[PDB]
Structures are given as structure tokens and as C-alpha cells.
RNA sequence: CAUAGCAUAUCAGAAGGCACACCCGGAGAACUGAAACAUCUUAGUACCCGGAGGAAGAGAAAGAAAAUUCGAUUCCCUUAG
RNA sequence: GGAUCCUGAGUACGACGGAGCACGUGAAAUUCCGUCGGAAUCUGGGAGGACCAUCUCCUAAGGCUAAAUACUCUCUAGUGA
RNA sequence: AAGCAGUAAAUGUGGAGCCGUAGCGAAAGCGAGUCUGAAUAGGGCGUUUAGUAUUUGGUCGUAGACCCGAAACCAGGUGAU
RNA sequence: UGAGGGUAGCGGAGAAAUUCCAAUCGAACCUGGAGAUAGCUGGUUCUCUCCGAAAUAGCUUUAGGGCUAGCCUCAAGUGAU
RNA sequence: UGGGAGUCAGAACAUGGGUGAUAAGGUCCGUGUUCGAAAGGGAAACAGCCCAGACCACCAGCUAAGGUCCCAAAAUAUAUG
RNA sequence: UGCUGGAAGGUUAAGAGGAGUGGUUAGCUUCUGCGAAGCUACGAAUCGAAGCCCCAGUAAACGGCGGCCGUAUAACGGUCC
RNA sequence: GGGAUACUACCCUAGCUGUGUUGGCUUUCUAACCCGCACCACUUAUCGUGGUGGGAGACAGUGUCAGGCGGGCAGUUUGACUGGGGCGGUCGCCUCCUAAAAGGUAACGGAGGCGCUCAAAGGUUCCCUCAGAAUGGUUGGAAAUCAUUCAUAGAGUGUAAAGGCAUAAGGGAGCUUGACUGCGAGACCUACAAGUCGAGCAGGGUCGAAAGACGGACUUAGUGAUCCGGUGGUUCCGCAUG
């Protein structure tokens, strides 16, 4: 029947121009007092999924 | 010795962080640094 | 089994892939690393900076030249004719 | 006294089973998956009960829109995993 | 026209506990359930997914309703890369 | 696509819908730019053609899903010859 | 010791032993869920050619399982790297 | 660049090393080789040793490790001791 | 410890008492708090039943009937509890 | 003096009255309600029924709600590693040796540290430069303190060992607040998660005469996702508009 999606992962990443997947970083959302500044802003970015996890997860995102 | 959070006057956010020592530094320390709201190194104090 | 007594000297670190990364002759970038170290085995010379971890980076792009420094010591040069 | 009860005197309305395939109700779990498990899911499934009709049920505006409302209801496709 | 009159009460609604409604008594506002309480009656009342003001709609608490839909114990007659 | 003429075909009919032809940004928004931003910068993402429909083959997914095989759990019943 | 009866499985009975409850019982038997589940074992159907490994890091309620990487294979591209 | 996979129990040799008892056809790493997945010759038989990689014939030839009195093909061959 | 009994010294609901209040507003001032009589929503000062702390009792109730230096409370001096 | 009689909750020390209508404390009534509570009867059915008298009595009981007890009962869990299992022991990071002159590399293999500290042990500017040994002396336990030469940094360098260090990164004086904002080409490690070093850019400041130099300590450890929850600000959406 119709394929479902990983709703919880819908909420964590965005699709790009070509086909890629634009993700939020992690090690955030709490205490940064134990952290430096370079280490704080360089996490204020967004990265791309690697092809490996992509291989693992491709069937999950049919509808983006 | 705690997570020390200084409150700027009008930079408006709960931004800057450092170390202190209560035994060495029990009172409220203050000093100069760049609050980027204004393009200048201005004073802030513990709060 | 039966009573196998215990021990303690079973603790160590995860190594740090240290040492050099490039060699005498090859050409480089500006943000490029040349040597991860501790202390100063070799001192930066020309167009090189010593970062936090005594990590050496060539300021600029160019070839590398390890060489002695004093009577008995070492340094690094970087030359950008290229 | 009255009507009940009782009496006769009519009528048969009843049960019973049943295609419980479909339908409406009433009651109503586990193994399962989660790589263990309790929330969760399996599922309002399975099984019992009762109604059970030839279909049933629903159905006409205290509605949905900021609409200009198919104009009640029901059904098919999309909206859309 | 509509002034006046009529316009469905333990009802509406609330608290507590529980189910359900994709959505976990929680918003359940919508809708059921009990135990407590508990209303207005147009000049009123309700709804507008926390919510309400304004605005839109409607006027509850009474009833009936073919059509298109579902299944095949059957029956007929027929079909079968 | 549903649906309709047709006949359990076709073909025809049928344009509700779906993909692409501009992207960046959580978003308001902006547009070959856009986001951060402070600029355009710097950088990311872009940009600077070709795709869509049907079908074959291979994989994957949901349904027992290559096959046989438990101990055991649950619901309802039989049984004291 | 007989003929009649009375007790039902989460239960019955029991001078107690996990003992008995139709040749069986640490909770019987028939059906149904149910093709229950099975990281476990076994098995898995005609031919020729060409390439051709691995038994290793790493993380794991994980260790005889699994997911990436490693090393294979095929076809698109670049192309002396 | 993408498509489809299997492998995670490895074994012996020499060799560096640890552990053990300068024990083990032990055990853990490493560096190479062979088996696993590689038949054939030699090692009497002898998965890992020495030689060497089979497309298919042939009653042809040259060689390797090995070896040359009989079984069993090749020198009772030289010359030395 | 369990079991009682008890001083019941206190803390304890469901309950009573109500000093007081958002989201939106036709509302006193029209740069704005008497909260007013109106939807999505509420409080203290106080007490508060079983009981939980406090005390006697309880060993044919559970339980223990010990230990150290002189010494296999197995005799005894010191003894600890 | 010990609180404290102006006023005001208001009073033990009070007395007292009954008031619109009502509830507490307690008794009596009783219908209510109950009575496996005796008598009269339909029924010659002691069921049931009711009348009788008696009892009790608004009590409990029962419904809901809320509590505390509840192996009486039920469903689950009860880690791994491991020269079999088990007991023991350990499980996350940092440093050395094994580790074989790049890096890398195992062992229930060998040795040590960590779960922080310093607003001065930070930043800048300017001075200084080792203990130790003897050298020997009011002290002298020898040597404390002081004294002269050599001392290789051995001294010392906040915290384990390692590298490193007198450019002092060691130690002193003054200033201090760069223990700053927004970025960075790029490079390292690496399965992923990640983690690490960055020229320089604007920016703006501290110190310094300026040059310049400061994006935390000589380095290397000083915990830990994510969801959830919280708090505040908010280029924002937030329901017909508000």
C-alpha cells in the first residue's frame, strides 16, 4: 500500500536544490558555559547528510 | 565557583559567561568588553 | 571459572594522529596544517604560525622547507614562488 | 363493590431456528512490534451476547466559511502519508 | 408587517472522574458516560480547536425521510492464456 | 484520475488533480539571487536547461512475504463411566 | 464394596506426596486467535562463460546478531592523476 | 559518481614481540606467504610445508623442487676424500 | 520486629471558610485598573478521618540466649554490649 | 518593667438575652428507612404479599469521590565482559611502555592521573634569572634565614607522566579586562555522530611612546547527546480581523 514517512525525521532536516539534505547540528540546546566561542558559533551552522546515512535512510524520504 | 552570568545594562540579553571563585572573588566583578549592540568595548557587571 | 582475582593497569588513551602532515617540496594552502605537536620540536619560521596546541600552520600557499635553526635546532620555512 | 387477581370469550403477538455473509448495538484479551517492557501498538481485532433486515445506518441546518457555501445524508477520486 | 405572543429544561452549562472524536478529561472547544450541582427564555441564545472583542453563521434542547452504497446462503444464464 | 458511450474489450470521452519550467530562508519575506547578516561582501545554498508518461529489469518497503518447526499466552467449551 | 448422585481447571479434591482430576498435569482435552513468534537449526529444483573476496577498524542490553566503513561486482564519467 | 552484494568463528608456517614456565599443534598483536576459494609434482601416507596456477584435446619435446641398486624412470657415472 | 494498648503532644484529605484575580472586551479615566454584573480560567487566616510521630506492653509471637583478655559465659577473674 | 487598657481584631479573667433563618453538641420522636422480628391472613404456597405489634432509626447500609493498607493477587525485570559459566574485578576521558626509528596497532598486559583550578596562576608593558652542591657561618637539628663560586634549567614552571621552556612558557613591579562581537578561505582526524588548528576580514577596544600585541592559563584531561521541562528577549506565525 502507500508508503509512509518518518514524521519525526521530517522535523529535523530540509531538502536542497539537487537532492541533498540540510541538517541541524547537535550538541546544542543547553549549557554552553562549558564551551568556547569558536566552538559555539561554528555549531550555529547547518550541514549536509553524508551519502552513507543517506544510503541507510533513502527509503524514508519519499515525499520531499 | 559557579556558572557566572553577567547582565549587561542595555545589550538586552543574558549573554556573557566566565569563571569566578567565591573564595577569591565573592563580590560582584565588572569590567570592559565588546557589547556588539554599539560597536565599542563597554562595561558590564555581575548580576 | 573459579576465583579469578582482579587487576587495575588496564587503562589507556586514544592516540592523537600526531607528527607531520606534509613534506619538503610539496605545495600547500593558506589554512593548511603541516605539523601537529606538543611543545616545540621545530619552531615556525617564515609564513608560519603556531596555534594553540603548538600546531603549526603555514600562513600562506607555497612550498615547504624544513631546515636547521641554530647550531643544533630546527625550524620551518615556507616559500611561495609557485 | 372498582379494576386488579380471577373468569370466561376473541385474536393470535410471541417464542424457534437462521447466510449471524453484510449491518447496528452490548460486552470485549494475548501472543506481537517497540529488537527487553509498563505508556503506546497489535485492536475496538478475535470470541461471545442481542438484534437481526433485505439492505442497514445516517440524513435536512444552533453546520462551514470568512464562503459567493456541494447547499441534508451516503458513496468514488484527489487534497495527503 | 412583525409590536406583543409562540418557538422543544433538571434542559443548556459547570466540577470530578473515564471512553471516543487522527488528535491521550484533556482545550475536547465538538461528542458520550455516571456522581454532584445547575440556566436564560429574542429585549434572548449558540458557534466560530487556548481563546475571546469585533465580525460571520445559526436559532438547541420534537419527529420522519427514496436515491445513489454493502454481502451473497441462493437462483438463473453464462465466462474462464 | 474518478466517471461516461461501449461489451467483463478497445478506442473515444472525461483536466478534480499530479511532476516539471527558480531558488534561498525556521519564517515574515526576497528572487538569479537569497540566508546570515553589514554590505552584494565572506561563505553556504544557488544560478548558469530538459524533463515528463507508460513499461521492462534490479533492489527496498507494507501485507505471513523463500519454506517447514517450539516450549508457551489468551477467548469459549468438553469431562469425575 | 456396589447402585444412584454432587464438586471443574486462575479451578476442584486432597490423613500432603507437585498427589489425582478418562494410560499424560509445576495447572487436562477440544476448538479458534494462528500461516502466533523464532537474531535458532535444517532445507531451497537445468546449463556455459567473465570477474571474483572476507573472517578487519568502529558503536552497540552487543558479542555465533546488527550498521556504516574496508575489501567485490556492474555501468556512467573523468582521465595520466 | 551511483546500482546490487557477501564477509565480522579465520588456520598453519617463517618472522618480530608480549603473556605463559626463554611450557604447548597454546594465547594476543604485527610483517609476509599458503589454505579458506587452487587441482598438479616432491615431502611414503601428510588442508597450510618445497616446486608450480589446469581453456580443451595428443601415445610429441625441455625443465623445476626433487632425484638416478629392486619394488619404481632415470648414473652400481666420474674423481676426490 | 510483629501485635496490642495508651499520653492521643503534633502533623493529614475528600470538606468548610473567600479576604482576591488572565486570553478577548461594548466597559471610569479615551496613553488605560473598584474589576467590574458577561465566554476560554481561579485563591488564605484557619481547622482537616483512618492514621503517621511519642510511651507502656508483648518471646507455647517472631526473634536472639552474645563477644574480648586470662580461656577446646564448652569452669571461672576482667569484662563489652 | 513582662506584655501593655487613645483607636482597633477584641478578650480568658465573665453576666446575659433571643432576635430574619439556619447549621454544628446531645437527647426524644418518628413515620422516612431498616429488622435472617414475633402475631393475622391470600396460600392447606412459614416463599411472596401485606396488616399487626415490636425494634432500631435518621443511624448505618448503598452509589460516586477521595485517601491510606493490600505477594492476597497479577504482569514484568533481574547488564555485559570473562582462556566455560560463576565469585571477584571492571565498564567514561587524559599521559607513558609494550608498539617493531612515519603514523597506526591487542592482551582479566604493564605504570600513573581525571570528573578541577587561577579575576590573577588571566592580558599587556618593563625589570630579574635556577635550585642544588659545597663554600659556613647569631640560627646551626646537617642544612631553617643570610653569605661566595660553580651550578643546565637538574631549579622552578596550579593540577598525573610526557614532551617541552631562560624566545623564559620561570619569577617580580605597574597597568589592567582580548577570559570581545560577527565571520573566515583553508587544513587535520574520522565509519557516522563529532572533535581540532586557522591566516585574515570588518569591527571595535586594553596596554604600550608607538611598533605592535591580546579571540583565556606552555600544551595535552576537567563529564554526556536528544527529547522533555523551565526562564527571558524575539527581523516571526499565531485561526474572519483584532
Question: Alpha carbon A25 to chain centroid distance?
Answer: 7
Q: Do A31 and B3 touch (CB under 8 A)?
A: yes
Residues in chain C: 82
CA distance A50 to A41: 22
For cell 579469578, the residue is C4
Domain ranges of chain A: 1-64
The DSSP result for C4-64, as a single string, is ---------------EESS-TT-B--SS-EEEE-SS-SSEE-TTEEE-TTS-EEESSSSEE
For this experimental structure, what is the resolution in angstroms?
3.2
Contact partners for chain C, using 3 or more CB pairs closer than 8 A, are none
Pick the CATH number of B1-47 from 3.40.50.10320, 3.30.565.10, 2.120.10.30, 2.20.28.120: 2.20.28.120
Chain A residues 4-63 within 7 Å (CB) of strand F:
14, 16-18, 20, 22, 46, 48, 59
Amino acid at each position: 500500500p502507500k508508503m509512509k514517512t518518518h514524521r519525526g525525521a521530517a522535523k529535523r532536516v530540509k531538502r536542497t536544490a539537487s537532492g541533498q539534505l540540510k541538517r541541524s547540528r547537535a550538541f546544542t540546546s543547553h549549557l554552553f558555559a562549558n564551551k568556547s566561542t569558536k566552538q559555539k558559533r561554528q555549531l550555529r551552522k547547518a550541514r549536509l547528510v553524508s551519502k552513507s546515512d543517506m544510503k541507510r535512510v533513502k527509503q524514508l524520504l519519499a515525499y520531499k | 565557583r559557579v556558572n557566572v552570568t553577567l547582565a549587561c545594562t542595555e545589550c538586552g540579553d543574558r549573554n556573557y559567561i566566565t569563571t569566578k571563585n567565591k573564595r577569591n572573588n565573592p563580590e560582584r566583578i565588572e569590567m570592559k568588553k565588546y557589547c556588539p549592540r554599539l560597536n565599542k568595548y563597554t562595561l558590564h557587571r555581575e548580576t | 571459572k573459579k576465583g579469578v582475582s582482579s587487576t587495575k593497569n588496564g587503562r589507556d588513551s586514544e592516540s592523537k594522529r600526531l607528527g607531520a602532515k606534509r613534506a619538503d617540496g610539496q605545495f600547500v594552502t593558506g589554512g593548511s596544517i603541516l605539523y601537529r605537536q606538543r611543545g616545540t620540536k621545530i619552531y615556525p619560521g617564515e609564513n608560519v604560525g603556531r596555534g594553540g596546541d603548538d600546531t603549526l600552520f603555514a600562513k600562506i600557499d607555497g612550498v615547504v622547507k624544513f631546515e636547521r635553526k641554530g647550531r643544533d635546532k630546527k625550524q620551518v620555512s615556507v616559500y611561495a614562488v609557485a
